[PDB]
């Protein structure tokens, strides 16, 4: 697998690329700026700037931005999490010259027309009025609120309608001018790109970007609404983090676990996270599932089996992202790797960290993170038969 | 903190510490209690 080569410019912006023989490319800008860096007075600034970022910059007033990136034939894209913001373009490699200049405008020289600001406010607000339809997102934005009470990690990416309505260009300008620093930025490219050409384009454009205790609280939120047909319940404990080595032995544990829609998640933030399971079931069976889940976590903690570990190591092995997955998937990995680890971890190092995992250290790490821990519980729907906190806390351990 | 991680976190060990402690507690309680009763009367 070709190595990911990283350079660093005056601004501090990093320019990471991983050349591949695929023909198109996914060039993106990552920024270490999310809802965790907001201070409850600008709780929707990143989301609303993510809406405003494609509505024209000085150089591209009006629909120019979308038009050109449309003409070139590039499906631009963007997203915001609690810690990272990404603006990426998938385009024919030859178009890097413009895929990069366009990205430069989007990060700097952007224009937040107040007129547009008004509309985006309405857009965000109205969607939020309906964002309630995404029960799962709701469950996961409370599994965050009740687990990180009193911290900037409880607040959602979208923010409360309140802030959305109460936001102005200057505020946005601040978030833009405060959390868009060049040392906190990665220009990532994946696919048919040359690293020297991309470095020269980053020196030509984007060389102007200015250079400048999270806690988990074992708790419970229960939103009871009996008119909903199905119930969604998420139970999590404190994830190790992004950099913690044991994350890998925890991923194998998730691969061992894999009622209904019983997914499993290991969400990681800067030295924190949520490790757990989300399941949707008919109200009458919520109790059973919650118990089954526990029994399983407990199984790994005291009774793993090399065979199953293997099953888990292999599934993890087929999850690692690679040139095969495509440019975007890879870029995305390049941007997150340079933002979180500070380097791109190659797949050989991932394979080494997977093959060093055995059953004994898996049950040791699972006992470190699951056994006798206070979970965060978030339920939405007909959740009366969902057990309260003593029964779940008692199910977090075995007498035997 | 060490104790929790050593004798109070694993339920089996929790029982062990309880049983062993109780085994000795009687000795101590009886002894101490008797001292008091005698002193009183």
């Amino acid at each position: 697998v070709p190595e990911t080569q990283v350079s660093i410019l005056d601004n501090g912006l990093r320019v990471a690329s991983e050349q591949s023989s695929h023909a198109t490319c996914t060039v993106g800008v990552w920024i270490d700026a999310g809802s965790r860096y907001e201070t409850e007075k600008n709780n929707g600034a990143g989301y609303f700037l993510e809406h405003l970022a494609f509505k024209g910059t000085k150089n591209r007033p009006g629909n120019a931005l979308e038009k050109e990136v449309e003409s070139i034939g590039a499906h631009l894209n963007a997203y915001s999490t609690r810690e990272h913001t990404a603006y990426l373009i998938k385009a024919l490699s030859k178009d890097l010259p413009k895929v990069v200049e366009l990205l430069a405008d989007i990060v700097q020289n952007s224009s937040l027309e107040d007129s547009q600001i008004e509309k985006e406010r309405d857009v965000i607000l109205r969607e939020m009025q309906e964002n309630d339809a995404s029960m799962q997102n709701v469950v996961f934005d409370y599994l965050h609120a009740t687990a990180f009470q009193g911290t900037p990690l409880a607040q959602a990416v979208e923010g409360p309608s309140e802030n959305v309505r109460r936001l102005s260009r200057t505020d946005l300008t601040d978030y833009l001018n405060r959390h868009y620093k060049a040392p906190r930025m990665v220009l990532a490219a994946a696919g048919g790109v040359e690293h020297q050409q991309l470095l020269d384009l980053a020196q030509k454009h984007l060389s102007s970007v200015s250079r400048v205790p999270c806690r988990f609280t074992g708790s419970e939120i229960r939103h009871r609404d009996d008119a909903l047909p199905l119930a969604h319940v998420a139970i999590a404990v404190e994830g190790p983090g992004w950099a913690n080595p044991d994350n890998v032995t925890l991923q194998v544990a998730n691969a061992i676990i894999g009622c209904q829609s019983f997914q499993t998640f290991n969400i990681s933030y800067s030295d924190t996270g949520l490790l757990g399971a989300h399941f949707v079931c008919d109200a009458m069976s919520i109790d059973d599932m919650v118990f089954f889940l526990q029994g399983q976590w407990m199984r790994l903690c005291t009774s793993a089996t090399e065979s199953e570990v293997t099953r888990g190591k292999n599934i993890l092995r087929n999850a690692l992202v690679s040139h095969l997955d495509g440019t975007t998937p890879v870029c995305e990995d390049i941007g997150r790797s340079l933002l979180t680890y500070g380097r791109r971890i190659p797949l050989a190092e991932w394979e080494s960290r997977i093959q060093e995992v055995d059953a004994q250290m898996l049950r040791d790490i699972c006992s470190k993170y699951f056994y006798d821990q206070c979970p965060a519980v978030a339920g939405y729907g007909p959740i009366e038969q969902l057990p309260d906190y003593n029964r779940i806390r008692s199910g977090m351990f075995w007498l035997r | 903190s060490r104790l929790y991680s050593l004798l109070f976190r694993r339920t089996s060990t929790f029982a062990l510490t309880i049983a062993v402690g109780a085994l000795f507690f009687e000795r101590a309680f009886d002894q101490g209690a008797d001292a008091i009763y005698e002193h009183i009367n």
């Binding site: 009193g150 409880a154 309140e162 | -």
Partner: peptide, 21 residues
């Protein structure tokens, strides 16, 4: 929606360690 309000304050209840607790 689900973000309109934030978790109520438990300051009078919260105790200002887990292993010990």
């Amino acid at each position: 929606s689900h973000t309109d309000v934030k978790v109520p304050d438990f300051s009078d209840y919260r105790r200002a360690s887990s292993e010990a607790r």
